[PDB]
Amino acid sequence: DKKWLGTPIEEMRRMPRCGIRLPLLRPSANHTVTIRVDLLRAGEVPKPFPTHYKDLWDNKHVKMPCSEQNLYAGSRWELIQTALLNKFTRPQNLKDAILKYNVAYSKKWDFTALIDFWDKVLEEAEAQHLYQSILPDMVKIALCLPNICTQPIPLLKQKMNHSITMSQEQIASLLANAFFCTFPRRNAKMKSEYSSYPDINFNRLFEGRSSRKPEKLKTLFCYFRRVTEKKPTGLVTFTRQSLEDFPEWERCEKPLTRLHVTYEGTIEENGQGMLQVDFANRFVGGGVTSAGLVQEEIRFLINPELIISRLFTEVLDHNECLIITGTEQYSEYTGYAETYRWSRSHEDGSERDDWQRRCTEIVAIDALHFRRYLDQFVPEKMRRELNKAYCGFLRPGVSSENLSAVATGNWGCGAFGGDARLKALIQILAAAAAERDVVYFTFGDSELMRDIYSMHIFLTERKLTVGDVYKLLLRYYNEECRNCGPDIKLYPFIYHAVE
Numbered sequence: 001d002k003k004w005l006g007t008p009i010e011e012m013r014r015m016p017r018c019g020i021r022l023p024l025l026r027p028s029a030n031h032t033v034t035i036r037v038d039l040l041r042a043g044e045v046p047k048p049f050p051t052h053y054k055d056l057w058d059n060k061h062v063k064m065p066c067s068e069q070n071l072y073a074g075s076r077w078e079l080i081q082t083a084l085l086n087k088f089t090r091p092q093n094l095k096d097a098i099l100k101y102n103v104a105y106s107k108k109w110d111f112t113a114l115i116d117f118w119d120k121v122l123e124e125a126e127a128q129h130l131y132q133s134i135l136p137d138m139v140k141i142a143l144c145l146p147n148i149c150t151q152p153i154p155l156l157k158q159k160m161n162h163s164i165t166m167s168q169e170q171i172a173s174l175l176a177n178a179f180f181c182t183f184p185r186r187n188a189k190m191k192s193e194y195s196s197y198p199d200i201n202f203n204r205l206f207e208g209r210s211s212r213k214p215e216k217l218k219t220l221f222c223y224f225r226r227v228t229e230k231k232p233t234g235l236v237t238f239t240r241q242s243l244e245d246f247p248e249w250e251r252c253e254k255p256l257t258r259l260h261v262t263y264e265g266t267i268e269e270n271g272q273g274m275l276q277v278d279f280a281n282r283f284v285g286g287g288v289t290s291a292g293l294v295q296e297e298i299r300f301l302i303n304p305e306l307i308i309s310r311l312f313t314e315v316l317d318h319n320e321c322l323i324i325t326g327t328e329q330y331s332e333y334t335g336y337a338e339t340y341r342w343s344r345s346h347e348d349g350s351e352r353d354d355w356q357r358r359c360t361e362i363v364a365i366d367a368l369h370f371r372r373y374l375d376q377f378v379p380e381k382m383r384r385e386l387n388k389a390y391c392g393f394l395r396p397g398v399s400s401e402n403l404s405a406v407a408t409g410n411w412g413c414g415a416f417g418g419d420a421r422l423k424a425l426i427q428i429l430a431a432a433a434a435e436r437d438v439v440y441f442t443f444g445d446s447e448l449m450r451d452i453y454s455m456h457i458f459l460t461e462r463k464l465t466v467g468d469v470y471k472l473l474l475r476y477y478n479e480e481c482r483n484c485g486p487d488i489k490l491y492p493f494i495y496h497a498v499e
């Protein structure tokens with residue numbers, strides 16, 4: 001009957017209470033900081049550093065639309081200014097503007113969803129507000145980019161252990177540019193440069209007739225209305241983490257940690273101050289700028305500062321994750337995929353830390369996509385998922401007492417074909433190896449809650465280590481999968497093996 005099982009969620013560690021005092025925010029070889037730390041003050045808009053725009057146009061940094069190297073020779077940035085500084089009264093005006101500096105895509109890019117949103121979804125007053133106020137304000141913050149993002153932004157490339165800390169205001173200027181599709185070299189289907197990076201320009205949000213698109217657009221315009229009306233004052237950190245020292249899982253003598261499991265609630269609302277998992281695509285954010293609308297995309301829509309990770313985050317390799325600290329929630333929603341609806345504007349009540357970052361930490365970890373259900377029990381694939389989750393959970397240089405619980409759920413299930421009971425145990429083992437408790441949301445599935453709880457209590461009461469459990473997974477593969485759906489399910493197999 002009960003709605004939750006295991007350790008009370010009130011007993012789990014959360015930020016900021018559990019953290020240590022942050023070191024002085026400072027730029028270094030592994031930390032890009034794009035604002036004046038000496039002037040960072042609560043409730044004040046951060047000042048960009050440096051004061052005057054500095055450009056880098058190379059294979060290691062974002063290619064900025066305002067670069068003097070962005071040519072067409074004509075200046076693409078001048079063309080963008082001329083195109084966007086026109087009155088919009090009808091959606092065709094905005095399509096024509098975006099296409100003036102995207103001539104090569106004038107036959108490839110469809111704007112049906114934008115036209116339908118403006119003309120067929122919005123009432124007359126809402127459309128009027130969109131084109132008299134919201135869009136012109138978005139144009140202005142976009143065109144302010146050279147005065148806002150004065151410091152080159154390095155790409156968080158494969159195998160880099162590197163962090164970028166920037167202001168929410170800087171992110172808003174960059175995302176307004178993404179909306180107007182101004183980022184060069186990010187568009188071609190057959191590009192080699194940036195082929196390993198996600199889409200950033202928003203043009204696919206404008207294509208097609210899904211009922212999903214107006215909801216995505218409502219969610220994003222809620223954000224844009226908010227951050228053009230009053231500049232957000234905080235910072236956001238993006239950290240790419242690449243590990244090479246992974247556990248020898250079969251030999252790991254670490255005990256399991258604590259579990260709270262519930263079929264009610266969500267990661268983002270009920271896991272406040274916890275390490276919140278994004279069920280990510282290896283191209284971070286997935287189809288947020290196109291058709292996708294499941295856990296990752298929804299989180300990227302209600303916390304749009306996440307979307308800018310796509311500007312500079314290379315596709316994740318198996319040993320990598322992306323950790324984002326400080327994104328703000330601007331929207332509330334209901335549903336998902338075909339039922340997703342924008343509900344209302346959200347006033348984020350999270351505390352900020354000593355770097356003026358909202359106390360919200362999200363980790364993008366991408367599960368594997370399994371063509372065949374039994375493929376996921378292959379030991380190499382189980383080890384891969386363990387190592388991915390471990391990389392997402394591990395904080396080198398931090399004591400376990402200062403680590404929040406992990407707030408997660410059915411990672412890699414649904415579209416990717418993962419088995420929820422296996423993935424729950426994999427996350428429990430990885431969390432144990434990283435010395436972090438687990439808060440698990442089963443998203444309405446009460447039987448799964450009971451099953452994960454019962455397995456966890458079974459294993460903990462018998463004092464099985466991480467390695468004891470991993471060896472049982474290996475036995476399951478050999479006994480029920482390798483020479484095989486299997487005859488016996490995983491948790492029944494485990495109970496029988498141990499008993």
Ligand SMILES: Cn1c(=O)c2[nH]c(SCCN3CCOCC3)nc2n(C)c1=O
Nearest residue numbers: 266267294295336409410413414441443
């Ligand atoms: C724990 N958890 C979720 O599982 C979740 N799924 C979604 S939409 C995609 C359908 N899912 C159904 C459950 O299996 C994973 C895929 N939003 C979610 N949120 C906000 C959440 O907190």
